[PDB]
Design a protein around this ligand. Structure first.
Ligand code: TPP
Ligand code: TPP
Ligand code: MG
Ligand code: MG
Lengths: 669, 669
């Protein structure tokens, strides 16, 4: 193949592409890409299997840059190996408006970028999810007497910042526990973070911690020039079937810069023109700005013929499989196509007012079990709360290292990693539909991962029980107050709060339909009735009318409610009606969906000339003015809660039928 | 001395007080308290130095229950040893309205409870902070010549949940890095969590991970009956000065219950009548409901005498210290009183409009440096972003194992533990004023800790820079959108967004005065002018008027802005005024403070008959209807951002002077 001198020229081409891009943008991070260039060379030219001309090739290795600030590293590699989403012109538009080379890698913008990173620690956890998906599909579909149709590795580059974040310890505890032997993490061990040398705050023995988590650990003491040792480490990682592998690769940040290498000044500011000149001279690099010599392209652009071959070979393995296993093939194809099975929505049961009330956590359990046999891709579970959140799929066992084909994911007390893992599962783009769960209050532990589902267009289903003071005695550390508001404010997240059976089914219907946008479902601990006119379809409208006192007669006062509080509005309406008032009750299960409706629909629910308006929800008034206006009133709770039985809490905090009636009268003047 | 038999009676009294209390409430967690009773007996009767009749005794050892679901354990020990906050009638009111025995321990309700737990992992981190406070004060004030005036240990009991949470790895990494030898953590290694046996999701080698983090580890294989071994273990921990110590104590959850021990069924539900009778029989306990034998009280109530004597001996040591070191004593006394120095607010600078328009992050650095000499208790720092958040106190070094007297805390990339550690520092109740910092977007990593500051009444100052799209090219993973709304919605948190120098000084003034309520301050990356009539005092009003076209005449239109966008409102005002409109501009730095003002004040700023209202803020419209109404308009950004230079982002997303003008025209109808 080719020489050490050519390998070195290839390595330096990665460094100077990154340097020159960041000097032109006047913004970004040259240090990590300079220190990691040798790893790039090996991974892209020699190890990973991928098709640069088909970023969606199902059986490709997955790469994740968890250290997302080094985005020029990944962009350089993609450019060099011939991805059409990163031509030279896009290298020259790093960090500019509408480029395909944003400051941190974004899956939703750049074909070949698998997940969105930037928030340290997310990527490694996304990688654990990508490896979960590969292990699961492999266990479900590979057969011992033909070539596999699922067989690929998951590679992740991460730095010191990822290693300090708690979320990465969570995810990597789970990866050890699951024995995910095709996950290979490469740690850029460069002794530098933003504050300076890592000895200022970070002296732990990372390798020992990883051994404790159940990982194999390989030490590459010279990541700057030991290409043979990186080749050997990666080969050894692949021969460890049984445990995930951490390759601790010691580098100099900004390797090549004579004056700024090994300093935090090369972390995150361009080298600039004098040091750039000095680095060119120090690395013996006579090529001009953005000039990659053609012989380096000849090397890396070899990925194209290799990638076409790998993909053709896979198609042959699939043809051979399909010949002996036509039924299993059909199921594999239908799942990995990402198309939802025809009529899956018909699996959802329906309810009537006559049916005795259940908690929406119980309805949720019903929907998960109704859907699981209809949706082969449904996978997931709770963060140590299965007997409370009610999330188990009865038709499957527990995903474990003995048993990867099982579909219940048991995350333990690891909310944050759980959300990020689910992002990886979704973004494998294999038809897996991940759901995860905890008490709604503990969305606070996993908030960045949830925001990441929204930003990266990953249809993760967040199943969040015990949604209010209705949980009772556990008290204010466990009772949501600001949570609904905090999610309504978040861009591109659906926040659904169903009242009764039909609305819970309707929440799940929205959630499953939405394969490119996450849905958070707030569910009750306590029973609620099935209220007349509540419906599956109404949830899809976001807000809809469930009661008018007289057809064709404009309401005097509009009462709007969600979840367990909808019954307070319907009961208040009956009291106000018996007095002589005309009342509309509106159910408001999903504010985002309401805002997508036509102006005429919105006006049909909340007529602009009826300004007597009351909202009822066991949560803060914050946000509700959007619908209740300045002259309206909220019945809810804006303070923290308390430790007492639920019925006492509703009484003491004034979240009662009588309060809604009183507020309505106040709005009427 | 005390007999082995009598020690066993004492341990069983703890078990049955917990059991009996939980059966009466019909709610709560008997399993942990049953498994951990032997560790309670040893800690309370033999190890810890405390005065049950003075829960504020400055030199007490601090205990923290990180596994806060086992609250009846702590309440039983406090009752038995004579804390007046937990008489028997309060044990009989566990989890009931307005009791001093809430379902999870709350510092803000029960004197003697040091912090609030319930959310797994918080407590251990709070313990790291309490230990940081002791070490810092001991280094600052102890002299080699006389007895110490600061010398106490920090004990923490935590379980498997706490161990699984990433937050605890973060804080224990720092505890090891800082060599906090007076932190002693007792791990309830019971192999049980809510989902069942821990092997379902948690098989890591915890002991080896703690060794990697820099801790001493001691194994107690029989925490159920080996009292001598617990005694030895704790003694050995007090003799390792150099490292924090984890004592891994294996117990049987629910020890004593012949049918429900070692099962998740004893985790979280009362034993109930049949199993309680069976457990009484199995443990040979003839005493009735809530009946603690006289001889067991005679033992635990020994704490009263011992405590009086410990505190008196401390006073002697302080009298001896003060006789030799009058200067130092006076400083110690003044700090530790928690009273702020006379006229500390005069330290803060004032600004005029033609002063150079700095970023509010630069103004924040000025305030930090202004206050550090004036406020002896100011302590804290950034999560690896000192050079970008601009948070260093120039007059001090870095807190480290060699140098505990220094005041800058260098947290590394550990936002969540950083907040919880600060809660522990503040809640030491020794006059330390902690501040901590990251990019505002990463509040999402640390959200529960921040919430616990609010709930626990800890005046942590959250210094949060890069508050918007004004940061530019790092793009949407770094750009806040929903974050101002998400904190305005949080109970008992101040969310301040200062425009200019004076407002930034004003934000700091609020934040310092608030020792019992946290303050989050959203600060800009980018420069902004000092606007005429912006003021230190106006921040305290929450919203205030900075411009009227003509004094004494009602505005036609009200423009309200915050932070970097306030200049858009002022610039718009001028344009509207040239068209003949009378315009009022209102700066809105803190919503919570505005809502504290009188009805007359609020009406003076926002007259209820002027409905033409525009808000401008580079964040979502969510929430603003509270002030803008149904008829007003918001100029901001409700979507995620993008990776480009900041000026391009403002133009592209329409956050411009001319958009505010057109919106004001639209509201005028
Ligand atoms: C969760 C989170 N916290 C903070 C930041 C801000 N930030 C960006 S890079 C960085 C330092 C990371 O150091 P390291 O991963 O070792 O990168 P190197 O400087 O070695 O390239 C930080 C703190 C971030 N991106 N995400
Ligand atoms: C952050 C957080 N997530 C979830 C919970 C819900 N919860 C309460 S106790 C518990 C499990 C406790 O396991 P462990 O700490 O081992 O306690 P044990 O059952 O052994 O007493 C959980 C998951 C919580 N309290 N906090
Ligand atoms: Mg580094
Ligand atoms: Mg346990």
């Amino acid at each position: 193949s080719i020489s050490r001198d050519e390998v070195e020229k290839c390595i330096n081409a990665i460094r100077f592409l990154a340097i020159d891009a960041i000097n032109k943008s006047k913004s970004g991070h040259p240090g990590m890409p300079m220190g990691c260039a040798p790893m790039g060379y090996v991974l892209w030219n020699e190890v990973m299997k991928y098709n640069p001309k088909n970023p969606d090739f199902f059986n490709r290795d997955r790469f994740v840059l968890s250290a997302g600030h080094g985005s020029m590293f990944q962009y350089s590699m993609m450019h060099l190996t011939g991805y059409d989403s990163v031509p030279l012109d896009q290298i020259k538009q790093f960090r500019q408006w509408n480029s395909l080379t944003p400051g941190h890698p974004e899956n939703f913008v750049t074909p070949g970028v698998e997940v969105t990173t930037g928030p340290l620690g997310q990527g490694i956890c996304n990688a654990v999810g990508l490896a979960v998906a590969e292990a699961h599909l492999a266990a479900r579909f590979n057969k011992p007497d033909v070539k596999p149709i699922v067989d690929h590795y998951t590679y992740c580059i991460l730095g010191d910042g990822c290693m300090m974040e708690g979320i990465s310890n969570e995810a990597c505890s789970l990866a050890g526990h699951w024995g995910l032997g095709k996950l290979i993490a490469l740690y850029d061990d460069n002794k530098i973070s933003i504050d300076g040398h890592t000895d200022i705050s970070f002296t732990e023995d990372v390798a020992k911690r990883y051994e404790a988590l159940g990982w194999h650990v390989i030490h590459v003491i010279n990541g700057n020039t030991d290409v043979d040792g990186l080749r050997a480490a990666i080969a050894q990682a692949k021969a460890v079937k049984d445990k995930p592998t951490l390759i601790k690769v010691s580098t100099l940040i900004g390797y090549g810069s004579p004056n700024k290498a090994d300093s935090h000044d090369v972390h995150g500011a361009p080298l600039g023109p004098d040091e750039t000149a000095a680095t060119r001279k120090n690395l013996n690099w006579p090529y001009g700005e953005f000039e990659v010599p053609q012989d380096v392209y000849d090397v890396f652009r070899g990925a194209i013929k290799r990638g076409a071959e790998e993909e053709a070979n896979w198609h042959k393995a699939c043809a051979e499989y399909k010949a002996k296993y036509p039924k299993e093939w059909a199921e594999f194809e239908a799942l990995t196509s990402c198309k939802l099975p025809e009529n899956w929505e018909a699996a959802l049961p329906h309810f009537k007012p006559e049916d005795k009330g259940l908690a929406t956590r119980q309805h949720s359990q019903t929907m998960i079990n109704a859907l699981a046999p209809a949706l082969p891709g449904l996978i997931g579970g709770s963060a140590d709360l299965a007997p409370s959140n009610l999330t188990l799929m009865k038709i499957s066992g527990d995903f474990q290292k003995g048993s990867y084909a099982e579909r219940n994911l048991r995350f333990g007390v690891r909310e944050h990693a759980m959300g990020a893992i689910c992002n990886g599962i979704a973004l494998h783009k294999s038809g897996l539909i991940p759901y995860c769960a905890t008490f709604y209050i503990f969305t606070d532990y996993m908030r960045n991962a949830m925001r990441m589902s929204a930003l990266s267009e990953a249809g993760v289903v967040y199943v969040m029980t015990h949604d209010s003071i209705g949980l009772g005695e556990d008290g204010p550390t466990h009772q949501p107050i600001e949570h609904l508001a905090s999610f309504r404010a978040m861009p591109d997240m659906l926040m659904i709060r169903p009242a009764g059976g039909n609305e819970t089914a309707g929440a799940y219907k929205v959630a499953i339909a939405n394969r490119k946008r996450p849905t958070t479902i707030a569910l009750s601990r306590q029973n609620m009735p099935n209220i007349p006119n509540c419906s599956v379809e109404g949830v899809a409208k976001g807000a809809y009318t469930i009661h008018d006192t007289k057809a064709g007669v404009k309401p005097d006062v509009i009462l709007m409610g969600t979840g367990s509080e909808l019954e307070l509005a319907t009961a208040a309406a009956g009291i106000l009606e018996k007095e002589g008032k005309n009342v509309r009750v509106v159910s408001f299960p999903c504010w985002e969906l309401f805002e997508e409706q036509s102006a005429e629909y919105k006006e049909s629910v909340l007529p602009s000339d009826v300004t007597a308006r009351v909202s009822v929800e066991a949560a803060t008034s914050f946000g509700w003015a959007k619908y209740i206006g300045l002259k309206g009133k909220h019945v809810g709770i804006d303070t923290f809660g308390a430790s007492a039985p639920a019925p006492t809490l509703y009484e003491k905090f004034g979240i009662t039928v009588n309060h809604v009636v009183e507020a309505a009268k106040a709005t009427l003047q």
